[PDB]
């Protein structure tokens, strides 16, 4: 993926988050810090936080990342679409993993219900990777489809948290 997209991925709590636009920031519910009084200098009360299972969306009252453009955000990718899971590691190493996305579904993961899309990695995902984006290109427009939330032990299945309607 291009550098402009990688720069949108920043460390966030126990995982990562993705600047969809200067004002919109998506991450995993499992990683958002629950005791924080602010994110990126903005008092938490001024941030509009939305939550759809494991998809956590933060709308900021003013542009924060003015250097980025507004990307397309969609609920998953068409079934069979090969996407790239942009994993950043704590070291700073970039570890783009290719995945073929599959069934959209409401899934039960460890008792909890998760809205998202199953994928298959095509050297895998690890505990610190949640919140990293699933990205693919459609023509000339890059598209983010969700954020990493889970991966099935004993197989290549990974779970991409998506946002509902
Ligand atoms: C906040 C502290 O924990 C973390 O590090 C959070 C991020 C890690 C990243 C995983 C960590 C490893 N490889 C990865 O990519 N995620 C999880 O652990 C998730 C659970 C799994 O990955 C499990 N997968 C499934 O249950 C699962 C079921 C199906 C189907 O697919 N995966 C186990 C492999 C750990 C946490 C979770 C629990 C309930 C939910 F509603 C939704 C999510």
Residue numbers in the entry: 1 to 122, 132 to 174
Question: What is written in the article reporting this PDB entry?
Answer:
The protease plays a crucial role in viral replication by cleaving the polyprotein into individual nonstructural proteins. HuNoV proteases are cysteine proteases structurally similar to picornavirus 3C-like proteases with a chymotrypsin-like fold. Their active site features a catalytic triad with histidine-30 (H30) as the catalytic base, cysteine-139 (C139) as the catalytic nucleophile, and glutamic acid-54 (E54) as an acidic residue which orients and stabilizes the conformation of H30 (15). The substrate binding pockets S1 to S4 in the HuNoV protease, which accommodates the P1 to P4 residues of the substrate, are in the cavity between the BII-CII loop (beta strands BII and CII, residue 102–117) and the DII, EII, and FII beta strands of the second beta-barrel.
To understand the role of R112 in ligand interaction, we determined the crystal structures of the R112A mutant of GII-Pros complexed with rupintrivir as well as enzyme and inhibition kinetics. In GII.4-Pro HOV R112A, the rupintrivir-bound protease backbone shows the moderately open BII-CII loop position seen in rupintrivir-bound protease structures from other GI and GII strains, indicating that this is the most stable rupintrivir-bound conformation for HuNoV proteases. Surprisingly, there is little change in backbone conformation between the respective rupintrivir-bound WT and R112A proteases of all GII strains. Our structures of GII R112A proteases in complex with rupintrivir further show no significant changes in the protease backbone between rupintrivir-bound WT and R112A proteases. However, our assays with R112A mutants of GII-Pro reveal that the R112A mutation does not significantly increase the potency of rupintrivir against GII-Pros. However, we observed that the R112A mutants of GII-Pro are enzymatically less efficient than their respective WT, and surprisingly, the R112A mutation in these proteases has minimal effect on rupintrivir inhibition. As a result, we observe no changes in rupintrivir potency against the protease. These results imply that with its flexible sidechain, R112 may displace bound ligands, including cleaved products and inhibitors, by acting on P2-equivalent moieties positioned in the S2 pocket.
